Amino acid sequence: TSVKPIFSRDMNEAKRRVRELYRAWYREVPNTVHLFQLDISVKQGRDKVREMFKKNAHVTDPRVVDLLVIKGKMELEETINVWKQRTHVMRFFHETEAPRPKDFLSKFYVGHDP
Amino acid sequence: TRPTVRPRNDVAHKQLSAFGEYVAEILPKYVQQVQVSCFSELEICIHPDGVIPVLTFLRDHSNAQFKSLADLTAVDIPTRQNRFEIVYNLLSLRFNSRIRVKTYTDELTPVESSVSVYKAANWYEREIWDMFGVFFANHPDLRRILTDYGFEGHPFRKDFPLSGYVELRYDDEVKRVVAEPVELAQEFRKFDLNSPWEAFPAYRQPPE
Amino acid sequence: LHHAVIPHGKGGRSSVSGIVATVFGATGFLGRYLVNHLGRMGSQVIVPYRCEPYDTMHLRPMGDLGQIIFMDWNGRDKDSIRRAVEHSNVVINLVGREWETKNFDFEDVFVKIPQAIAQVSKEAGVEKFIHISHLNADIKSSSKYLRNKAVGEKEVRETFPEATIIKPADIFGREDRFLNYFANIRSLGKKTVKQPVYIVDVTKGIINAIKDPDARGKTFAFVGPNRYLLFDLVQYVFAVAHRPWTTRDKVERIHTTDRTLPHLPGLEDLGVQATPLELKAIEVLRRHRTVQPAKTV
Amino acid sequence: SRGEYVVAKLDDLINWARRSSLWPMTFGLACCAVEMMHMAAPRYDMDRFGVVFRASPRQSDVMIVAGTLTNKMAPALRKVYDQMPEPRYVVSMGSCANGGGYYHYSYSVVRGCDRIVPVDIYVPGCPPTAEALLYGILQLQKKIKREKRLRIWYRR
Amino acid sequence: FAYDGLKRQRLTEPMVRNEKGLLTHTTWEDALSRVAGMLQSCQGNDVAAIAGGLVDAEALIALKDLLNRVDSDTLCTEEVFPTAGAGTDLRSNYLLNTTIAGVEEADVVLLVGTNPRFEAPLFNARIRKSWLHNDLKVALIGSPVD
Amino acid sequence: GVRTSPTGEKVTHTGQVYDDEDYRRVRFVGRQKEVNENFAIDLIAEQPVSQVGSRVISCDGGGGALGHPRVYINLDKETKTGTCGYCGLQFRQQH
Amino acid sequence: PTVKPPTARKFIWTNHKFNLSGTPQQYVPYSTTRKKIQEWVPPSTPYK
Amino acid sequence: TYKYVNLREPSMDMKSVTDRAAQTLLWTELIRGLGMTLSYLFREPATINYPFEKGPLSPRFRGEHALRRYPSGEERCIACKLCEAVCPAQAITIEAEPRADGSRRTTRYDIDMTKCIYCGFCQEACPVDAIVEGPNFEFSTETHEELLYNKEKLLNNGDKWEAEIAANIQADYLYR
Ligand SMILES: CCCCCCCCCCCCCCCCCC(=O)OC[C@H](COP(=O)(O)OCCN)OC(=O)CCCCCCCCCCCCCCCCC
Numbered sequence A: 001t002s003v004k005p006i007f008s009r010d011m012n013e014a015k016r017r018v019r020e021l022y023r024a025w026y027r028e029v030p031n032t033v034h035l036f037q038l039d040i041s042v043k044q045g046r047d048k049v050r051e052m053f054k055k056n057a058h059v060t061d062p063r064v065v066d067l068l069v070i071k072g073k074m075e076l077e078e079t080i081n082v083w084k085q086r087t088h089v090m091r092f093f094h095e096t097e098a099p100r101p102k103d104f105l106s107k108f109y110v111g112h113d114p
Numbered sequence B: 001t002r003p004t005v006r007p008r009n010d011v012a013h014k015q016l017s018a019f020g021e022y023v024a025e026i027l028p029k030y031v032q033q034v035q036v037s038c039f040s041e042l043e044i045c046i047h048p049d050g051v052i053p054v055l056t057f058l059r060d061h062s063n064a065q066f067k068s069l070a071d072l073t074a075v076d077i078p079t080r081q082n083r084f085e086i087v088y089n090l091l092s093l094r095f096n097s098r099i100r101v102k103t104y105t106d107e108l109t110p111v112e113s114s115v116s117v118y119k120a121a122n123w124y125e126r127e128i129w130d131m132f133g134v135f136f137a138n139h140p141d142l143r144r145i146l147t148d149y150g151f152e153g154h155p156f157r158k159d160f161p162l163s164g165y166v167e168l169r170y171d172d173e174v175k176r177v178v179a180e181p182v183e184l185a186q187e188f189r190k191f192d193l194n195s196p197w198e199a200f201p202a203y204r205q206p207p208e
Numbered sequence C: 001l002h003h004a005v006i007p008h009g010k011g012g013r014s015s016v017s018g019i020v021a022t023v024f025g026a027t028g029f030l031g032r033y034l035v036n037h038l039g040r041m042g043s044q045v046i047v048p049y050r051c052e053p054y055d056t057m058h059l060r061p062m063g064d065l066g067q068i069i070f071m072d073w074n075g076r077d078k079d080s081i082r083r084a085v086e087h088s089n090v091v092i093n094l095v096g097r098e099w100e101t102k103n104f105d106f107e108d109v110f111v112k113i114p115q116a117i118a119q120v121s122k123e124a125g126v127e128k129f130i131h132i133s134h135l136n137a138d139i140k141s142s143s144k145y146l147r148n149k150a151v152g153e154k155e156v157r158e159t160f161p162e163a164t165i166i167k168p169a170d171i172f173g174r175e176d177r178f179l180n181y182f183a184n185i186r187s188l189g190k191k192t193v194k195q196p197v198y199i200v201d202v203t204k205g206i207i208n209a210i211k212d213p214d215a216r217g218k219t220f221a222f223v224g225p226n227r228y229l230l231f232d233l234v235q236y237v238f239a240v241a242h243r244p245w246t247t248r249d250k251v252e253r254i255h256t257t258d259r260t261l262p263h264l265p266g267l268e269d270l271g272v273q274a275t276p277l278e279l280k281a282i283e284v285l286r287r288h289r290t291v292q293p294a295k296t297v
Numbered sequence D: 001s002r003g004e005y006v007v008a009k010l011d012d013l014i015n016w017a018r019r020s021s022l023w024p025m026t027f028g029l030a031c032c033a034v035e036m037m038h039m040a041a042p043r044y045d046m047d048r049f050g051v052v053f054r055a056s057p058r059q060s061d062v063m064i065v066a067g068t069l070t071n072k073m074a075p076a077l078r079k080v081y082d083q084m085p086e087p088r089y090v091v092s093m094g095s096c097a098n099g100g101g102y103y104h105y106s107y108s109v110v111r112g113c114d115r116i117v118p119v120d121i122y123v124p125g126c127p128p129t130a131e132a133l134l135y136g137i138l139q140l141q142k143k144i145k146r147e148k149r150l151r152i153w154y155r156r
Numbered sequence E: 001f002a003y004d005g006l007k008r009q010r011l012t013e014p015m016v017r018n019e020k021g022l023l024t025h026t027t028w029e030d031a032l033s034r035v036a037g038m039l040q041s042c043q044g045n046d047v048a049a050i051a052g053g054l055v056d057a058e059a060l061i062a063l064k065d066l067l068n069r070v071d072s073d074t075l076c077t078e079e080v081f082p083t084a085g086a087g088t089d090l091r092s093n094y095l096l097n098t099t100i101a102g103v104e105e106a107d108v109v110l111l112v113g114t115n116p117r118f119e120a121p122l123f124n125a126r127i128r129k130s131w132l133h134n135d136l137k138v139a140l141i142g143s144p145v146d
Numbered sequence F: 001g002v003r004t005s006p007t008g009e010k011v012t013h014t015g016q017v018y019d020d021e022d023y024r025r026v027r028f029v030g031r032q033k034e035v036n037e038n039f040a041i042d043l044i045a046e047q048p049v050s051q052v053g054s055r056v057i058s059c060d061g062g063g064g065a066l067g068h069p070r071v072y073i074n075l076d077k078e079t080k081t082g083t084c085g086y087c088g089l090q091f092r093q094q095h
Numbered sequence G: 001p002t003v004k005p006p007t008a009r010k011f012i013w014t015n016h017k018f019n020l021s022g023t024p025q026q027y028v029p030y031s032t033t034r035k036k037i038q039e040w041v042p043p044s045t046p047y048k
Numbered sequence H: 001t002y003k004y005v006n007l008r009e010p011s012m013d014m015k016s017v018t019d020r021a022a023q024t025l026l027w028t029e030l031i032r033g034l035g036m037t038l039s040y041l042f043r044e045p046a047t048i049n050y051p052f053e054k055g056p057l058s059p060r061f062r063g064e065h066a067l068r069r070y071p072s073g074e075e076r077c078i079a080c081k082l083c084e085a086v087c088p089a090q091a092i093t094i095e096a097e098p099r100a101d102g103s104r105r106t107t108r109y110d111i112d113m114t115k116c117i118y119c120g121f122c123q124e125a126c127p128v129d130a131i132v133e134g135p136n137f138e139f140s141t142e143t144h145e146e147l148l149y150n151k152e153k154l155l156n157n158g159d160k161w162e163a164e165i166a167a168n169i170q171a172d173y174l175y176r
C-alpha cells in the first residue's frame, strides 16, 4: 500500500489541481463557444464543464485524480489550440442520440436491457 | 533435423548469456531476471525505478553502445497485477547485437520517461500513453498521438472491445459528424479456435 | 404484428424500429429531417421521388444499408402511389409548393395528390397516414395556398378518417423559407402576429404521432412557444443576420396572422418541448453574416 | 413537343460537357492512392478521358475516396465534401472506403465512407486494379450521361 | 434433443381477446393494463396462481409477492405434494435428502412408486453405477418397469 | 426448377420466399429478385446410377486434383444405392 | 475460343449479361434462409 | 562492400573551372533535361485503349467471387465452413442444413464484398474447389448493398463465368 505518486502526495494537493483545471476550463469556455462558433451558450458549456467535473466527484485516490487532471489538461490543450474541430467539442452534447428510457417500465417496453 | 528445422546459433547464445551476466552484475540494483531465448535474443527484466540507469548504461557503456532505440512497446497482460509490460528494443551498431529491456507498471504507477536517453522514445511512449494509458512522468509533450481527439479509453488494453464504444456517422440535422453508441449490422463472430490438446510439452506449466 | 416488423435493438442505426414509412414529398425541407430522424431509429423508409436522383443523394447517408428505398412516382399516377404504399405501415404526406407551376397548381398539389395518396393508402391497408396542412388553412382565406390546403385537409379527413392531420405554423430551420426569406428580402410591417415553430420540434412531433396510437384521427396544431408581431420579428431577423423570388401569394401568407386553436392539441400533447426562436436563430442566420430578443405579445 | 426536344438536347449538351470534363479530387488515404496513381500512370492514363490528374480540390467534380476512412479524418472528409461546388459526385474506391474493409470491426474506422458522404459509384477491391477504377470512372460518366436535369425541370 | 421445440409454437407477442372472443396481438401496455385492471378488482381468494413445470424461482417469488400485495395466498403448483403433517415447512420431507452422489455410499435402495429411469434418468444412471461398482441391492415397490 | 409463390415471387432452391405481409418485398419493387434457376438437387437427380461390379468403389468427382477428396463408398446394401458425400453421384453394385 | 473452345456445361449461361447496376435488372440482396422461430398461431374458434 | 555517393572533389584547373562556369552560364544540364523530355516526346506512348484494350492478367488473378459446380450441375460447396474460418475479413457468412435428399449443402452463403480483402484464402482453403475468385474485376456498383452477395448472386457468377474459371483453374492447379 506504499505506492509511487504521480503529482499529488495526498488529496489536498489533488483537489488543488482539480480546482486549477476547473478555473482553466471556466476561462476557456467563452473562447471555445466563439472560435468554434458553437450553437450553445456560454452558460450551457459551463454547465457541461460542471457536469463533467461532478461526474468524477466520488474518487478518493490521489493517483486517479492526478490522471483525471492530466487527461483534463490534455482535453483543454486540444481545445485551446484548435486541434479538435467543432464536432469533437459538440460530442460532449449528445444531441443526435435519442433520450434513453430511464424507469423500469419504459425499459421493459423497448427491450431486454436492465 | 537438417532441412526444415531452424539451425541453432550456439555462439550468439553463449555470447548473449555472458553479456547478460555482465549487465546483471554491473546493475544488480535493478536487474531482476536475465533470460536468453532459444532463438538467441537477450532479455533484461528490470525494476521500473531503473529505466534511466539501465538504458543510459546500455547507451553509453563501452562494451554496450546500444545507441539505437529500435522500438518501445507496452504489452497488456491483465492477469498480472502490474499488467503493463514496457519493452525496450535496443540496437548496438558497434557490436552488431540487440537487447530487450523489460519492465512493468499498473494503471496508476508512472514510468519515468526515457527521452533523456533516447529522443526516439518521444513518440513511442506517447503512443503507449494513447494505447494503454501508461503515464510517463517528466515527458516533454505527452498527449494522444493516434486516436481521435475526443477519444475515451485506451484501445490496446485487452478489456477494451474490438469495435469500440462509439462509432461515427454524418448527421444532416446538425450538419456535423456525430458520435453515437456502436451497433454492428453483423457482429464480429468470435471463434474459439484453441485445441483441447497440449501442443508443446516443453512449455507445460507445473500444476498447483 | 408480423415478425420482421417487431422492434429490436437499442434504437440506433442498425436497430429495427418496426416503422415502415413511405414519405411522399421527402426531398424537401421537412422530408429531409423526417427521413433523418426515421433512419437513425432503424426504420425502413420509402422515398418516392419525382426529381433527379442526384437531388436525393443527401438522403442516402441517413440510414443503414437497404433502409431507404428510392422509387419513381408521379402525382397523377395511382399505380406509382400504390407501388410505394403497399408495403408500408405509415404514409407521411409532405407534398407541397410555395408557388404554382405550369403543370401542378395549388389544387393539384394540395387537393388532388393528397387525396389520391390517402385513398390509395386506405385501400392498401396502411394503418397510419399523417397529412401536413397549414395552421392558417381556411376556406375563406385570401391566399390560394391556404384555401386549397384547407380543402385538401377536408378531403384527406373524409377519405382516410383515422389520419393524423398536423398544422405547422411557419417552420423555421436552416433550409426554411421563413427566416431565409426575411434575411434575403432586405415585406412591410403590419398588424400580423406569428408564432413560428422549429423544424426539429415538428419532426419529433411527427414521429411521436407515428408512435402514439392516440394520434389516430386527431388534428394537431404545431406552434412555437412565443407569439411575435411580424415587424419586430423581421427586425430581430435583420439584427441577428447583422443586416441594416417572390409572389403575391407569399405576401398574402406573410400578412396572415397565426390563428390560435386551443381546442386542437399541439406539441405538448405529443410530448415535444417547443424550442424558441432565440436559441436557433443564430443557427439559421449565421450563414447570412458577412442582439436584444424579439418582443412577444 | 418543341420544348421537350430543346430541353432534351440541352441535357445532352450539358451532360456531355460534365462527363467529358471530370476533374477529380482524390482522397488518397491509403493503399488505393497507389492504384489511382497507376490509373493516372501512362498505361491507363485518366487524362486522355478528360479526367485531369491532380486537379484542384476547390474546382473538382468527383471526390475519389481512395483509402481507409478513419474516425479521425471523417470530419475533414465531410469538410472537403462540403467545400465542393455542385454537381459533385463521389467514387468510393476499395473495400475500406466501401464498407470498412479489412478494418471493419476496428474501433477507429468509419465502416464505409457512405456513413459520411453520399456515394455514387462503389468500386470493389483491395485495391481494385487501376483498370477497375477506370471502369468505375467510366460507369460514373455513363451515370452522368443519363441524367435528366432539364427534362425533369421541364416536367415540373 | 428437445431444443427444437424451443423454436416452434413460441409465444412472441402479447395477446388479448377481441370483441369476437379470439386472441389477437397487442402491445405490452394494453395487455398489462387489462391484467392490472382485473387485478385491482380482486382481493382475497378472488385471485389465484398456478405455477407450471418450467418456472424459475425469480418469477415464483415475483408472482408470490404480487399476489400477496392483494392478500392472496392461493398460489399453487401443478404437481401435488401432500400437505399433511409438516407439509412443506421442513425441507427434509420434500428433498432427495441423501444426495444424488449419496447413492454411491448406499448399500440398500428401496424405490417406492417411481420409475426413476424415465422420471430422472441420471439419478437412475447413478443407481446403475452404484449397482455395478458397489454391488448395490435395489428393490422396487411399484409396477415392474425396466 | 424454380417455383412461384401466390404473391408472384420466385422461390429459391433453399425454399426462401417472402410472405404476403412481409415488408421486405419492397426491396424488389421496381427491381428484381435474383435467383439461380439451376437447382442442384434437380441436376444431380438427372445423373444415372453408375453400375459397378466391385463391393467398394471410389469417387473423387472427376478430374483428379480438380474434384473433391477421394472417398470409398460401400455398396453392400442392395436396397439403397451408395451416394457420394461430396458430389452426390450414386453407385450400385450390379450383382 | 475459336481455336481452343471453352468446355461446354449445361449450366453455363448461354446469354452473357453485362453490368446491370443502375438498371431494373440489378442485384438486390436478401436473406436466403427461412424463418427460424415459428410462432404460435392461436385458434380461430372461440374459447367459451 | 560500400560506395560513397557524392564524395567527389572537383578539379580546380582552369579547364574544369571553365567547364563548370560554362555549365552555369550556358545552362548545359538544363538543355540535357530538355533533350530527355524531347526524347520522350517522340516515343510511342505506353497508353492502352481501355475499354477496347485490356491490361494483361495472369490465370492467378483474384477478382469477383463465384460458387462452382461439378460437371453434372451439382454445386461443389458441402458447407464445411473452412472459407469463413479462414476469411481474414470475416466477409463470409454461412448457414447450412441437410437438403431434401439428405445432402450437406448451404442455405446461406453470403460474401460481403466490401469487407472482402480479395486475398484468395477462401479458394485455397476450399477442399472441393467450390469457392473460387474469378477474373471479373469490372463489377463496380452504384449502391452499397449490390456488393453484399448472397448465394444466388455467387451461383449466378459461377454459372456466368465457369467457362473461364475452369480454364484458369486448369492452367494453375498444378501450382496449388
Ligand atoms: C432546336 C435545336 C437545337 C436545340 C438546342 C441544342 C443546341 C446545340 C447543342 C450541341 C448539340 C447537342 C447534343 C450534344 C451531344 C449529344 C450526343 C452525345 O453526347 O453523343 C455522344 C458522343 C460521344 O459518345 P460517348 O458517349 O462520349 O462515348 C465515349 C466514346 N466511345 O459525343 C460526340 O460524339 C461529341 C459530342 C459533341 C457535342 C457537340 C459539340 C460541342 C458543342 C458546341 C456548341 C456549344 C459550344 C460553343 C462554344 C463554347 C465556347 C468554346
Ligand SMILES: NC(=O)C1=CN([C@@H]2O[C@H](COP(=O)(O)OP(=O)(O)OC[C@H]3O[C@@H](n4cnc5c(N)ncnc54)[C@H](OP(=O)(O)O)[C@@H]3O)[C@@H](O)[C@H]2O)C=CC1
Pocket (backbone or CB within 6 Å): C024, C025, C026, C027, C028, C029, C030, C031, C049, C050, C051, C075, C094, C095, C096, C097, C098, C104, C109, C132, C133, C134, C135, C168, C169, C170, C171, C172, C176, C177, C178, D156
Ligand atoms: N415552413 C414550411 O416549409 C411549412 C411547410 N408546410 C407544409 O409542409 C409540407 C412540406 O414542406 P416543405 O418541405 O417545406 O416544402 P418543399 O417545397 O421544400 O418540399 C415539398 C416536397 O414535395 C415535392 N413536390 C412538390 N411539388 C410536387 C409535385 N407537383 N409532384 C410531386 N412532388 C412534388 C418536392 O419534391 P421535388 O423536389 O421532386 O419537387 C418536395 O420533396 C408542404 O405540404 C408545406 O405546405 C406547412 C407549414 C410550414
Ligand SMILES: CCCCCCCCCCC1=C(C)C(=O)C(OC)=C(OC)C1=O
Pocket (backbone or CB within 6 Å): D023, D052, D054, D055, D056
Ligand atoms: C475558355 C476555355 C476554358 C478552358 C479551360 C481549361 C482548363 C485547363 C484544364 C486542365 C488543367 C490544366 C492544364 C492545369 O494546368 C491546371 O492547373 C494545375 C488545372 O487546374 C487544376 C487544369 O484543370
Ligand code: SF4
Pocket (backbone or CB within 6 Å): D030, D031, D032, D033, D066, D067, D068, D093, D094, D095, D096, D097, D101, D102, D125, D126, D127, D128
Ligand atoms: S480497400 Fe484495402 S488495399 Fe484499398 S486502401 Fe483499403 S486497405 Fe488498402
Ligand code: SF4
Pocket (backbone or CB within 6 Å): H083, H086, H087, H088, H089, H090, H091, H092, H111, H115, H116, H117, H118, H119, H120, H121, H122, H123, H133
Ligand atoms: S478473398 Fe479473402 S477476404 Fe475475400 S472472401 Fe475470400 S478469404 Fe474472405
Ligand code: SF4
Pocket (backbone or CB within 6 Å): H076, H077, H078, H079, H080, H081, H082, H083, H084, H094, H122, H125, H126, H127, H128, H129, H130, H131
Ligand atoms: S470452404 Fe468450400 S466447401 Fe467449405 S463451406 Fe466454403 S465454399 Fe463451401
Ligand SMILES: [Zn+2]
Pocket (backbone or CB within 6 Å): F059, F060, F061, F068, F084, F085, F086, F087, F088, F089
Ligand atoms: Zn464424389
